[PDB]
């Protein structure tokens with residue numbers, strides 16, 4: 001990833017040139033440029049890069065001409081745009097202030113709820129690019145369907161989340177069956193399955209069974225990834241993470257609170273109930289302490305270990321005939 | 337349309353049954369059901385019905401088996417869902433209160449900005465249905481691309497609109513070149529081109545030139561349709577329209593204000609400037625009077641006539657080899 005990151009970001013400028021070239025609509029296109037530059041840039045690009053890297057592990061290097069690669073870059077960027085769409089819109093729904101410590105787009109002066117359109121444009125740019133760069137490829141329809149299905153799964157996950165945590169404190173809502181379901185639909189499918197699957201299609205690997213196999217490994221990785229973000233949000237060194245966590249404040253249906261609830265004597269249940277999600281820090285400090293007293297960081301470390309054996313068993317069993325390195329590169333990024 | 341309206345609405349119940357049938361996500365699916373029922377029902381269904389009617393004018397009746405028709409119904413409903421998506425989201429952006437005199441969805445208790453997701457789900461349901469009912473048809477990809485392109489054009493139109501009227505009163509913004517551009521992208525492509533084009537594809541009529549021809553007629557119809565809504569908003573008998581108009585109050589870039597501005601001596605320009613878009617009625621009453629004094633209803637009636645010759649010339653010239661009745665049925669609905 002480290003090398004390839006550079007040429008991935010050089011390509012953006014071109015993604016944009018193309019998306020911004022009927023002159024009556026110039027102003028709108030100017031706006032689109034801003035929206036793209038503000039919202040698609042500034043993350044770590046892990047998802048989009050995954051498309052590119054996996055495309056290289058999957059194609060015999062004699063089928064990686066400069067146009068094959070230009071498409072891999074572009075489709076990686078399609079993943080990033082999809083993400084950008086979700087985030088811009090999620091920030092609005094959450095009433096968030098910052099994203100990656102920068103002002104959320106909808107919070108910029110004179111944008112506001114216009115960001116809903118802007119988010120929709122981001123989504124749309126995915127399908128323009130696919131047409132621009134892949135309309136003639138045999139995997140074209142495969143990729144349209146995959147991006148569409150990934151949007152649907154994500155949106156559904158979002159609904160499930162929204163129902164489950166209404167900003168209305170209800171911890172009967174916060175069960176494990178349900179936590180898992182949210183992670184899977186809202187983040188894992190697009191974060192993990194999507195980018196690999198896209199590379200699979202670009203490589204001619206379109207079998208339903210192959211995709212199902214890759215899916216079984218990749219959704220389980222995504223479940224751990226998110227559980228680890230939940231853990232880190234509260235317990236990560238915040239300069240090593242970058243994030244300074246607001247989960248508890250926010251009534252989030254976090255892995256921490258789920259385990260906590262399986263592990264509460266009633267005295268502990270109507271304490272947690274008197275504390276999950278106030279601005280004031282001593283009520284949030286108090287929760288961190290209930291978690292600490294229940295050795296939740298230990299439950300996690302136990303979880304991280306088991307999860308790691310499980311992912312390697314899954315890779316042993318279901319990678320074939322993809323090179324296991326497709327999966328292992330990702331495992332290394334996440335269990336780091 | 338009058339007969340066919342009935343079976344068009346009987347089909348909805350089935351669109352829904354299908355979209356609502358992995359049980360961990362039941363709650364979200366319940367929500368989706370509500371969203372669909374609230375937002376897809378209650379309009380006049382003109383756009384979706386246009387798909388169905390045109391499909392019948394375009395297919396030899398021996399190729400209208402019960403499954404061909406079930407698809408026409410479904411694709412008509414796809415148009416309505418697309419519209420529903422735009423409206424739910426537009427209401428949020430506008431801060432509107434009611435839609436068709438019923439509470440806008442985002443204004444319902446406990447929905448709020450969650451409606452952004454809800455709107456996204458509506459969009460997504462289009463592509464699920466297309467897959468469910470058309471994946472095996474030779475026009476499948478054609479329809480995906482058309483719905484996607486129609487979304488993009490609409491969203492772009494919305495951007496252009498948003499730039500042009502920022503709720504910030506600026507009438508230098510409100511030019512005719514620009515009014516036309518907004519109408520075309522924001523409403524005409526999806527309202528007029530989309531439904532016919534969809535029927536064309538379903539019927540094997542996929543030539544770029546045929547579509548371009550149909551487009552030239554249909555975008556010009558859409559331009560008149562919207563100009564007429566602008567006129568009616570202020571001058572329609574409000575029980576015959578149903579609507580009681582808020583355009584002037586809203587700084588809308590309306591046809592009325594555009595013509596008005598071409599037809600203003602400076603004394604009239606810095607009057608209009610002191611009045612376009614206040615809550616108070618005497619400032620809105622005053623505008624209606626400036627419009628009246630400039631014989632704008634007459635400019636309109638002159639416009640409606642000319643526009644009608646023009647549409648029939650266009651139909652004469654560009655309908656072939658579609659039956660002109662495809663276009664004429666629509667002209668009759670709109671010049672009524």
Ligand SMILES: Cc1ccc(-c2cc3c(N[C@@H](c4ccc5c(c4)CCO5)P(=O)(O)O)ncnc3s2)cc1
Pocket residue numbers: 042043044046047050100191192195229241242243330333334
């Ligand atoms: C398919 C796939 C998905 C995710 C990742 C990784 C994300 C990530 C990571 N991301 C974190 C992160 C992402 C973007 C970002 C920051 C942290 C701060 C600046 O912007 P997170 O998404 O958990 O808040 N940090 C350290 N290592 C990794 S590995 C790798 C592969």
Ligand SMILES: Cc1ccc(-c2cc3c(N[C@@H](c4ccc5c(c4)CCO5)P(=O)(O)O)ncnc3s2)cc1
Pocket residue numbers: 378379380382383386436527528531565577578579666669670
């Ligand atoms: C492709 C096509 C597009 C639009 C139409 C027509 C819409 C319409 C119409 N619609 C008006 C209307 C639509 C829905 C609605 C109301 C009025 C009140 C109840 O819900 P509008 O959309 O201008 O506010 N009213 C009377 N005749 C017609 S013909 C016909 C065909």
Ligand SMILES: [Cl-]
Pocket residue numbers: 043044045046047
């Ligand atoms: Cl990332």
Ligand SMILES: [Cl-]
Pocket residue numbers: 065067068
């Ligand atoms: Cl090539």
Ligand SMILES: [Cl-]
Pocket residue numbers: 379380381382383
């Ligand atoms: Cl209608």
Ligand SMILES: [Cl-]
Pocket residue numbers: 401403404
């Ligand atoms: Cl059939």
